Design a protein around this nucleic acid. Structure first.
Ligand SMILES: Nc1nc2c(ncn2[C@H]2C[C@H](O)[C@@H](COP(=O)(O)OP(=O)(O)OP(=O)(O)O)O2)c(=O)[nH]1
Ligand SMILES: [Mn+2]
Ligand SMILES: [Mn+2]
Length: 425
DNA sequence: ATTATGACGCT
């Protein structure tokens, strides 16, 4: 009862740019705006692989990881923007720079953890306390939440539903209690409306967000009402929400561990997890996963919002699938050099912007017919930002994989260089 | 022949 802590101490938001690469291209090219459009990498093989899809295009069934020539069968008016190609490979620089614009705006409101190029987590606990003191008991007006959904409401036209649910939530609110978790979430949501307004003002990019008490629920909330909307998932809404939530929808359960939860326990939905003791879950899935699942099915998660706005590694990768697999020494060298040249560019810019140097170079390759995604991963020292040296060292470090007697065998289907182990410079 | 990344856990 009174001692069962409920994981309601924090206010955490997950902000996610809607179809981010598409929006970046649509800011740059107005002819793409408010159209079915997608972003592709390469164009020769089946029109190129799609990596981002506007919501208008998604309404036709266009999805990520789909060939453009197939998407065009579903959506013949689909517009396509192409990823920049440099030194023979995809170059994602435009989107990393757009991402940094967005991150820098979010950082003005709270500390953020960059979770990927287009999404960050936000720790709003301090910001909400400050704002709750600034209101001095003043109640929260629906006008402050023009794009917010309250999950699970209303109970007992899309925008009409949204406003009814918001009204129920606000009427149920105890504004005099500066320590009510639900009030904290509500104020967090007001701040997130402001953050999203600033992001759109200052970049033109729209985003969705989730507001809850931890990262997993913030992330799950964010996806309930997309695009250009934010969803508040309260502690009290967890039992109903989870009672029909497929386990795979929860961050980190979408793969093998989630599948084994489903198969071993004989369940489908997140809420069924509550029926097992912590020890049972630890027995099936290990001590960490067990504790995490026992708390998470009750809506409780303690993973902190790490104050990290910048990537921890800087990486360059290219697949060589099918018959393009690299089969000679000259080929492997030239592509290691192209990779090392892009990496050198990104690293020098990183050192100038962010006052840090990487110290370790990781070289990963795949060989043809290998089942694994990394056939080999080996590290060496990274002592100067010079593409020729980095490529020479990556070769030095992988060359004993060649089993030929000038040739390369098994041919390589992936090269990958990653600078890691940053130190302040 | 979804591809390009990037975080993080296990050992
Ligand atoms: N190169 C590459 N980029 C990817 C891949 N998956 C996603 N991206 C890029 C394009 C996406 O716009 C961006 C962020 O991914 P998300 O899962 O958040 O989807 P996106 O923002 O496109 O749409 P959303 O509104 O979040 O449903 O990262 C991939 O497999 N390869
Ligand atoms: Mn997104
Ligand atoms: Mn995302």
């Amino acid at each position: 009862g009174p001692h069962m802590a409920t994981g309601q101490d924090r206010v955490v938001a997950l902000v996610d740019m809607d179809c981010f690469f598409v929006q970046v291209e649509q800011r740059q090219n107005p002819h793409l705006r408010n159209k079915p459009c997608a972003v592709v990498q390469y164009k020769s093989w089946k029109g190129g692989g799609i990596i981002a899809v506007s919501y208008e295009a998604r309404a036709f069934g266009v999805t990520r990881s789909m060939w453009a020539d197939d998407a065009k069968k579903l959506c013949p008016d689909l517009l396509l923007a192409q990823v920049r190609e440099s030194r023979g490979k995809a170059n994602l620089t435009k989107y990393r720079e757009a991402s940094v614009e967005v991150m820098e705006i979010m950082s003005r409101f709270a500390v953020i953890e960059r979770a990927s190029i287009d999404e960050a987590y936000v720790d709003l606990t301090s910001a909400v306390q400050e704002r709750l003191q600034k209101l001095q008991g003043q109640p929260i007006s629906a006008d402050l939440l023009p794009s917010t959904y309250i999950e699970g409401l209303p109970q007992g036209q899309k925008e009409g539903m949204r406003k009814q649910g918001l009204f129920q939530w606000l009427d149920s609110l105890q504004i005099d209690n500066l320590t009510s978790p639900d009030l904290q979430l509500t104020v967090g949501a007001v701040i997130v409306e402001e953050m999203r307004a600033a992001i759109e003002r200052e970049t033109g990019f729209q985003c969705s967000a989730g507001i809850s008490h931890n990262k997993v629920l913030a992330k799950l909330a964010c996806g309930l009402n997309k695009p250009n909307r934010q969803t508040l998932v309260s502690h009290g809404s967890v039992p109903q929400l989870f009672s029909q939530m497929p386990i795979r929808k929860i961050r980190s359960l979408g793969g093998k561990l989630g599948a084994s939860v489903i198969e071993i326990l004989g369940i489908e939905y997140m809420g069924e997890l509550t029926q097992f003791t912590e020890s049972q879950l630890q027995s099936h899935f290990g001590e960490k996963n067990g504790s995490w699942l026992y708390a998470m099915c009750r809506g409780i998660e303690h993973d902190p919002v790490k104050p990290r706005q910048l990537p921890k590694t800087i990486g360059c990768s290219k697949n060589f699938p099918g018959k393009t697999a690299l089969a000679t020494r000259e080929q492997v060298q030239w592509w290691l050099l192209q990779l090392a040249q892009e990496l050198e560019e990104r690293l020098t810019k990183d050192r100038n912007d962010n006052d840090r140097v990487a110290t370790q170079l990781v070289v990963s390759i795949r060989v043809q017919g290998d089942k694994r995604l990394s056939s080999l991963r080996r590290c060496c020292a990274l002592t100067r930002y010079d593409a020729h040296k980095m490529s020479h060292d990556a070769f030095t470090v992988i060359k004993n994989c060649n089993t030929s007697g000038t040739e390369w065998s098994p041919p390589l289907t992936m090269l990958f260089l990653c600078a890691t182990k940053f130190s302040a410079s």
